[PDB]
Structure 1
Amino acid sequence: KHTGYVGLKNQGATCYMNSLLQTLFFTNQLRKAVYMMPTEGDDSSKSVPLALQRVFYELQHSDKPVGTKKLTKSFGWETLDSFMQHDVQELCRVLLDNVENKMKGTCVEGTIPKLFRGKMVSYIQCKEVDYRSDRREDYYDIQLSIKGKKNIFESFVDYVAVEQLDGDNKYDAGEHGLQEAEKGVKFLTLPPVLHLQLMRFMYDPQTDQNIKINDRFEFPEQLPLDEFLQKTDPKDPANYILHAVLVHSGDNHGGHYVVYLNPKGDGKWCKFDDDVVSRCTKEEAIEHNYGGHCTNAYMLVYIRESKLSEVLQAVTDHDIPQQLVERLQEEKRIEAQK
């Protein structure tokens, strides 16, 4: 096991699930918080927080590939096409929603929003009359459009672009009646952990099957995002460091799923292809997954430069509470008696 990291078992069309599991396991600040969840009273079959702790503990200690059968059962995606019908951000939403709820009233409460929550302003500004509506919204990831864009920069430029509201799509200004208006979105804050979903998988009207766009789309190792802030901080620039590259190889519905990571944030990359984990070049993790063949990234994880050390803080064996280790060791001991 030259890498020091252990892989995950392939047990059905779980698809990206193993890529997401490794991506979250190496969000060290999240892993430590998951261990701390008060789970001793949970039922080892229905509880999703406990199943997530099991996978993370096995990923941290086992020399052999880690199984995920109890995880898949815990949140109930068990039909033939259950993972084909959803995408990675829904799975990530199902998981993170459960652990943040599990952290209520506990010492790691608010860890999910601290890591992933950003602040955003959506607006509608009337062009002929003085009226404006701003709604501040939270976001936990960003869906980036890639069709027609060459890189992450053009995808952000398109994200904050202004939309015209005229013709049939005039704005209902209420007292002012129908009005021509401008609609857009501004970024207030960017989170410590940036999850960017690249919109390569979409449905084409009038549809039957979902289509995957394999156009070339580039992303940098370092991503400066001060430009897209309404107001910047001299002591905390929005400089982001590429951490994970979730990759798909194959055609529209069918394909292989792999994740690349430099878990320490030191630019030393590894390929997490299911159970096999191996060192790879930086070029293979980033440049080779631009596309333009059928292998390319569909989700990216960036960590803010000033937050790298805390998000990726060290995780030892003593960061797992004793009651947790006793229960899982009891579980491994029970199954070993067959």
Structure 2
Amino acid sequence: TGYVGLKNQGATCYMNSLLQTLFFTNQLRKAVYMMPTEGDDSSKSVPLALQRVFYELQHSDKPVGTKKLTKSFGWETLDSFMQHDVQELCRVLLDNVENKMKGTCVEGTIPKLFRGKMVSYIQCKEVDYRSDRREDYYDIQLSIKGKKNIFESFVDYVAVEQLDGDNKYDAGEHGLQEAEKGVKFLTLPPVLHLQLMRAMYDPQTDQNIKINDRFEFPEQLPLDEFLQKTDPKDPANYILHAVLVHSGDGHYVVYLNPKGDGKWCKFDDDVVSRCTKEEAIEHNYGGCTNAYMLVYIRESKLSEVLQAVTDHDIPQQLVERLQEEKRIEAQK
């Protein structure tokens, strides 16, 4: 493979899977390295700690650890991971980084990479009144129960809902109204984080029940037909980068093809093996082991996103600090 694993330090669950997905977002990695953590607290700093994991992933020949990172964002006490969805762990990390990059030359990399735009509208069926609000989004949550595949989930996602008796829209001056609500996509970003809604509410066992149902997703994904305006110059065609997997009800795993080239690996904690396309994609449709999150890259943008990273893409200042820091760790 040429690729190093992560040590599975706590019940950090999905974290290793997420870290790897993020690491192989090369345009993100190289921005991360440029963050000015010169005088950042060694242990309190989330942005430092991420630089450390990345550094190590790029250099270590031996499984990489996460303790200082876990501690940094204070997710240690058991339940810290269970209580949160994978996209929340993402948000925490990216938000920290987004903010650290403020006032620098790499200011703006996060939104640049992950933020798409969207419109929620309410349209009264009988009256002229229409509310329009554009929203930003860094990730998309798809319904799967009773959907075959991505297309059916996306369909549902932009589906029109009717606001009738009881759910009647309060149209302000025009009282209650039969009205229809929907969402529609203005843009998609270079990198597309999709989460599949496999946990749902239990009015019985009162826990999060996992839906192991088959759900189908393609290696290539066209989305122009979900846009308002399409663009000939750059269509919304997406390339499958990463499949975050979970089996049971739990072991966590992630398949990547880091260069987007269909050369897949399986990343299970310390153990990284090359794997077949089948093992990565169809084998994880489900029906138990199955995907819960996908990562697509916009074909047009692959080469900037997955731009090559050299060892000289780490500031030598940063290297110095980490090397010293590693050295001083000398147990009798």
Q: What is the TM-score with the length of structure 1 in the denominator?
A: 0.97
Shift of residue 207 of structure 1? 5.2
Secondary structure of the residue aligned to 2:324 is helix
Shift of residue 208 of structure 1? 2.6
Shift of residue 337 of structure 1? 5.2
Q: Judge which range, 231-240 or 195-204, deviates more.
A: 195-204
Shift of residue 204 of structure 1? 1.5
Deviation per CA, 1:108-145, whole angstroms, max 9, x where unpaired? 10100000000101000000100100000000000000
CA distance in 2, matches of 1:167, 1:214: 35
Equivalent position to 2:159, from 158, 161, 165 = 161
Deviation per CA, 1:227-259, whole angstroms, max 9, x where unpaired? 1001100111000000000000112xxx10000
Shift of residue 203 of structure 1? 2.3
CA distance in 1, matches of 2:104, 2:186: 29
Shift of residue 18 of structure 1? 0.2
Deviation per CA, 1:187-246, whole angstroms, max 9, x where unpaired? 000000000000011222255311100000000000000110011001110000000000
Shift of residue 336 of structure 1? 3.5
Identity of aligned residues (%): 100
Shift of residue 328 of structure 1? 0.5
CA distance in 2, matches of 1:81, 1:100: 26
Secondary structure of the residue aligned to 1:112 is helix
Shift of residue 56 of structure 1? 0.2
CA distance in 2, matches of 1:41, 1:205: 50
CA distance in 1, matches of 2:166, 2:79: 39
CA distance in 1, matches of 2:86, 2:42: 24
Secondary structure of the residue aligned to 2:131 is strand
What is the correspondence of 1:132-147 to structure 2 with a 5 Å cutoff? 132-147=130-145
Deviation per CA, 1:85-116, whole angstroms, max 9, x where unpaired? 11111100100000000000000101000000
**Root mean square deviation, CA, Å:** 0.8
Q: Does residue 324 of structure 1 match 2:295? A: no
Secondary structure of the residue aligned to 1:19 is helix
Q: Judge which range, 233-242 or 202-211, deviates more.
A: 202-211
Shift of residue 334 of structure 1? 0.8
How many residues align? The count is 332
CA distance in 2, matches of 1:265, 1:176: 52
Aligned match of 1:263: 258
Shift of residue 20 of structure 1? 0.3
CA distance in 2, matches of 1:24, 1:310: 15
CA distance in 1, matches of 2:324, 2:331: 11
Aligned match of 1:295: 289
CA distance in 1, matches of 2:268, 2:329: 27
Aligned match of 2:72: 74
CA distance in 2, matches of 1:87, 1:125: 32
CA distance in 2, matches of 1:206, 1:200: 17
Shift of residue 331 of structure 1? 1.0
CA distance in 1, matches of 2:200, 2:167: 24
Q: Judge which range, 77-86 or 63-72, deviates more.
A: 77-86
Q: Does residue 170 of structure 1 match 2:168? A: yes
CA distance in 1, matches of 2:244, 2:225: 26
CA distance in 2, matches of 1:171, 1:181: 6
Secondary structure of the residue aligned to 1:248 is strand
CA distance in 2, matches of 1:227, 1:104: 35
CA distance in 2, matches of 1:173, 1:82: 41
* Structure 1 pair 131–101 and aligned structure 2 pair: CA distance change class (3 A): same
CA distance in 2, matches of 1:322, 1:187: 42
CA distance in 1, matches of 2:260, 2:90: 21
Secondary structure of the residue aligned to 2:295 is strand
CA distance in 2, matches of 1:335, 1:151: 50
Q: What is the TM-score with the length of structure 2 in the denominator?
A: 0.99
Secondary structure of the residue aligned to 2:82 is helix
CA distance in 2, matches of 1:185, 1:288: 32
Shift of residue 10 of structure 1? 1.2
* Structure 1 pair 172–206 and aligned structure 2 pair: CA distance change class (3 A): farther
Deviation per CA, 1:149-175, whole angstroms, max 9, x where unpaired? 000000000000000001011111111
Shift of residue 82 of structure 1? 1.1
CA distance in 2, matches of 1:256, 1:87: 15
What is the correspondence of 1:1-338 to structure 2 with a 5 Å cutoff? 3-205=1-203, 208-251=206-249, 255-292=250-287, 294-336=288-330, 338=332
Shift of residue 27 of structure 1? 0.2
Q: Which runs of 5+ in 1 are unaligned?
A: none
Secondary structure of the residue aligned to 1:169 is coil
Deviation per CA, 1:29-69, whole angstroms, max 9, x where unpaired? 00000000010110010000000000000000000000000
CA distance in 2, matches of 1:205, 1:12: 30
